[PDB]
Design a protein around this ligand. Structure first.
Ligand SMILES: OC[C@H]1O[C@@H](O[C@@H]2[C@@H](O)[C@H](O[C@@H]3[C@@H](O)[C@H](O[C@@H]4[C@@H](O)[C@H](O[C@@H]5[C@@H](O)[C@H](O[C@@H]6[C@@H](O)[C@H](O)O[C@H](CO)[C@H]6O)O[C@H](CO)[C@H]5O)O[C@H](CO)[C@H]4O)O[C@H](CO)[C@H]3O)O[C@H](CO)[C@H]2O)[C@H](O)[C@@H](O)[C@@H]1O
Ligand SMILES: OC[C@H]1O[C@@H](O[C@@H]2[C@@H](O)[C@H](O[C@@H]3[C@@H](O)[C@H](O[C@@H]4[C@@H](O)[C@H](O[C@@H]5[C@@H](O)[C@H](O)O[C@H](CO)[C@H]5O)O[C@H](CO)[C@H]4O)O[C@H](CO)[C@H]3O)O[C@H](CO)[C@H]2O)[C@H](O)[C@@H](O)[C@@H]1O
Length: 752
């Protein structure tokens, strides 16, 4: 009646009576709630609702907030759809020295408004359909309707009218520089180039005035790369092919490591003979990895400048990208030159640690910490301590994964609840608007999956579906479901076209959606790979490999700008902390200092963190910039994270800094994260830095034909690491010709 059994656990189906623990703080109490009752979607959109999208404000606001279907920005209003393009004169880079922040952003203006001839008083805008990256927004006023189809990577906006015709309204009269009757090429007063397309015979009127009109029930708008009539002619070819379906289909080739993704649209013809295809605008993370077979479709000189650099290309029905999955590990192995008794001391010191809150995030950080300690305890021969840590993980998870208490009533805290209205699993206690805004389910639940994966590595029985594995699989479905999931939308967190996760469930900001900790996203994907490998779930594993590998490609472009092509030259920092649809910030969601505005995109450190070391020149450049700003190696906070990061390129330096300060303070103290960040430990730090000192640099030039591995290179000497989750021994072949044998449930080397 009020909960559903899943193996030995359960989730609530009615909102629980929350146990506030006597806490009266209104912020805390307000967090223990639900997402909005009203969803602005039509009756054509049923089942679990998509969240965490670039377009989500359309579903949550009566109209919308400002959105970034690059190359455009748009927003829905009662009067119609405002369209804007950030030109170079709209873009700024600002620094607040006192705050230690930087901001790259544009403007919230209007180049023109797409209007309906019958009304400028629409009652609302709803989601009428969506696919993997386009949305169809429907402005409604009784008989009057205007359906707008648009998307990230679409230089078209398609507009379909019921009970009226087209109007384009400008504050200052545009320059119509090409008048083909039914097709016009035009520029705003400030020289931004667009085009509009109607069916043949439906001619544009009002040329030279502030208002352009057309009798058609269909128009398209395009952003033109240049004031160029040859480009206009090309845009005409696909202006009548309205995108209805759009899918990002992927494969993982386990033998080579190649993750192949094909982006395919299906269109509906608005004039006789319109082709089945479109003009895509590709982002850097896409076109830098374009498959050979798609190269012939590139429209070479078709460039658009946006927050994320230069978009380009590309015509037709589909295109394909190719990426390389680099492996992950369950932990670093025992290969460091540490004082083993010193490490054992740190492992025991860690029993003093405790969670600094009762919510899913703080509890998550704590269980992540225990899961990281357990394999290190095993390696040092502290086997009962390792079992103690895994026992504590079991006690915590077996609590959280049951929604009912001993009497069969719903609990008031430490439980999961299925919100049916949206279709999402919410955990209470909640924080960071995980429940009220559907935020951060990857960030939080990734830690629960880490804990489960460490249990499963030692105890396959616990992890069975009929035991505790069903509830873990339910949490994973919430944040990364496959298609046709009866409870959850497809790949909730991930935007397959933008290439990254979006953290905010609702997206009701004028900068679109955002993501701060890309490393906490990569942590979630890693842990699902590990969990799925441990539990024999190939389909789930491969989906997490696709996510890990794609997200990595976006991180290296938009957070790190490893290729030094995207961030403006005048932007001082060597990282963007928070990526939005519409802007980039060197800033945090909480009040922080200098280190945190870098390290929130490094933490936590774990067996999937080696992606951070693929670009040693970047690692050096970012570290040196942070050091310059600090003015020394007296890190303001989270010193251990900076040492661990530094170890990717200079472990001698990291070791020197660590030796100097790691023992400055003693046991766990929540009031002091100067030296050890609260999700980290001395044991983890010491183990990490000494391992990288012995191993050398991450070597992404070598792949393997199994997924759980890493390759390091120290002055030309390679070390090959594999962990085998199987009951049977395996042979792993590496792309440089090397091969190794691995026994069941072990590393090939450094089991300790
Ligand atoms: O060391 C002591 C110090 O530690 C800090 O903990 C760090 C922790 O905060 C950090 O968490 C990451 C987190 O940022 C991220 O979650 C965010 C989520 O926080 C964000 O919420 C925003 C609200 O912040 C915002 O607040 C509004 C406010 O800005 C405005 O001025 O006033 C309004 C008054 O009501 C207020 O509402 O509101 C918007 C909605 O409008 C919310 O969305 O939302 C984003 C998504 O949009 C979400 O991603 O993700 C993770 C947690 O889920 C974390 O990565 O993590 C660090 C490392 O673990 C911690 O060190 C404490 O916060 C400090 O208090 C301590 O002193
Ligand atoms: O200095 C001591 C105190 O500092 C603290 O932390 C600071 C921290 O709160 C701050 O967070 C930044 C966010 O405020 C910022 O949020 C922006 C939104 O406010 C804005 O909302 C608009 C809304 O105002 C308008 O009415 O409606 C719009 C929709 O129509 C809506 O968009 O949206 C922006 C995006 O569109 C959004 O950016 O977001 C920043 C990241 O981009 C955050 O960094 O950041 C400071 C720097 O890190 C922190 O110092 C503590 O919270 C206090 O307790 C301390 O006392």
């Amino acid at each position: 009646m009020h909960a559903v059994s899943v193996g030995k656990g359960s989730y609530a189906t009615e909102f629980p009576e929350i146990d506030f623990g006597g806490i009266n703080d209104p912020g805390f109490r307000d967090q223990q709630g639900e997402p909005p009752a009203t969803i602005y979607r039509s009756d054509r959109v049923t089942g679990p609702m998509q969240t965490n999208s670039w377009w989500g404000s359309l579903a949550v606001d009566r109209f919308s907030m400002n959105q970034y279907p690059h190359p455009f920005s748009v927003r829905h209003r009662a009067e119609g759809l405002h369209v804007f393009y950030d030109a170079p004169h709209n873009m700024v880079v600002h620094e607040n020295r006192e705050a230690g922040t930087w901001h790259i952003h544009g403007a919230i203006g209007t180049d023109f408004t797409i209007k309906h001839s019958g009304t400028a008083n629409f009652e609302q805008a709803v989601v009428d359909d969506y696919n993997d990256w386009y949305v169809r927004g429907l402005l409604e006023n009784g008989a009057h309707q205007m359906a707008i189809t648009y998307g990230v990577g679409s230089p078209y906006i398609f507009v379909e009218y019921e009970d009226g015709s087209a109007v384009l309204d400008f504050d200052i009269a545009p320059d119509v520089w090409e008048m083909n009757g039914h097709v016009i090429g035009f520029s705003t007063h400030d020289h931004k180039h667009y085009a509009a397309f109607a069916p043949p015979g439906q001619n544009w009127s009002g040329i030279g005035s502030k208002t352009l009109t057309n009798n058609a029930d269909y128009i398209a708008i395009a952003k033109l790369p240049e004031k160029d009539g040859n480009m206009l002619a090309k845009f005409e070819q696909y202006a009548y092919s309205v995108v209805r379906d759009a899918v990002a289909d992927w494969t993982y080739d386990e033998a080579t490591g190649t993750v192949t993704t094909t982006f395919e649209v299906t269109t509906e013809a608005k004039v006789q003979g319109a082709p089945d295809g479109t003009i895509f605008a590709l982002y850097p993370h896409q076109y830098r990895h374009l498959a050979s077979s798609s190269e012939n479709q590139l429209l070479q000189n078709y460039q658009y400048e946006i927050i994320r650099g230069t978009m380009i290309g590309l015509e037709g029905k589909r295109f394909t990208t190719e990426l390389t999955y680099p492996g992950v590990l369950p932990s670093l192995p025992d290969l460091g030159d540490y004082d083993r008794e010193r490490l054992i001391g740190y492992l025991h010191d860690a029993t003093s640690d405790y969670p600094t809150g009762s919510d899913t995030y703080e509890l998550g950080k704590y269980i992540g910490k225990l899961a990281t300690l357990a394999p290190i305890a095993d390696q040092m021969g502290e086997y009962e301590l390792a079992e103690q840590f895994r026992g504590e993980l079991k006690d915590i998870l077996e609590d959280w994964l049951q929604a009912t208490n001993a009497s069969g009533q719903l609990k008031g805290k430490n439980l999961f609840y299925y919100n049916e209205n949206w279709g999402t699993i919410l955990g209470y206690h909640a924080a960071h608007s995980s429940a009220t805004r559907i935020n951060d389910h990857h960030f939080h639940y990734g830690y629960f999956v880490k804990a489960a994966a460490e249990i499963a590595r030692a105890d396959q029985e616990w992890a069975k579906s009929e035991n505790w594995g069903g509830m873990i699989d339910l949490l994973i479905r919430d944040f990364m479901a496959d298609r046709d999931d009866d409870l959850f939308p497809y790949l909730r967190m991930f935007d397959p076209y933008s290439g990254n996760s979006w953290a905010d469930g609702l997206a009701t900001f004028d900068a679109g959606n955002n993501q701060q900790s890309s490393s906490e996203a990569m942590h979630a994907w890693t842990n699902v790979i590990l969990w799925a490998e441990a539990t024999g779930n190939k389909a789930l594993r491969d989906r997490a490999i696709y996510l890990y590998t794609t997200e990595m490609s976006a991180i290296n472009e938009y957070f790190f700008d490893v290729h030094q092509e995207i961030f403006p030259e005048e932007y001082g920092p060597e990282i963007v902390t928070i990526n939005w649809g519409g802007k980039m910030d060197h800033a945090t969601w909480w009040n922080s200092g200098k280190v945190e505005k870098y390290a929130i995109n490094w933490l936590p450190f774990h067996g999937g963190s080696l992606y951070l070391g693929h670009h040693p020149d970047y690692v050096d450049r970012a570290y040196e910039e942070l050091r310059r700003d600090i003015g020394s190696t007296d890190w303001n906070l989270w010193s251990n994270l900076v040492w661990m990061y530094r170890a990717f390129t200079n472990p001698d330096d990291a070791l020197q800094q660590m030796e100097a300060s790691i023992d400055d303070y003693g046991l766990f103290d929540p009031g002091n994260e100067k030296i050890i960040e609260r999700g980290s430990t001395k044991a983890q730090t010491y183990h990490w830095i000494h391992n990288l000192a012995e191993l050398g640099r991450v070597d992404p030039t070598v792949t393997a034909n199994h997924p759980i591995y890493a390759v390091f290179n120290k002055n030309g000497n390679r070390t090959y690491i594999v962990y085998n989750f199987s009951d049977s021994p395996i042979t792993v072949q590496f792309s440089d010709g090397h091969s190794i044998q691995v026994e069941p449930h072990s590393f090939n080397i450094g089991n300790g």
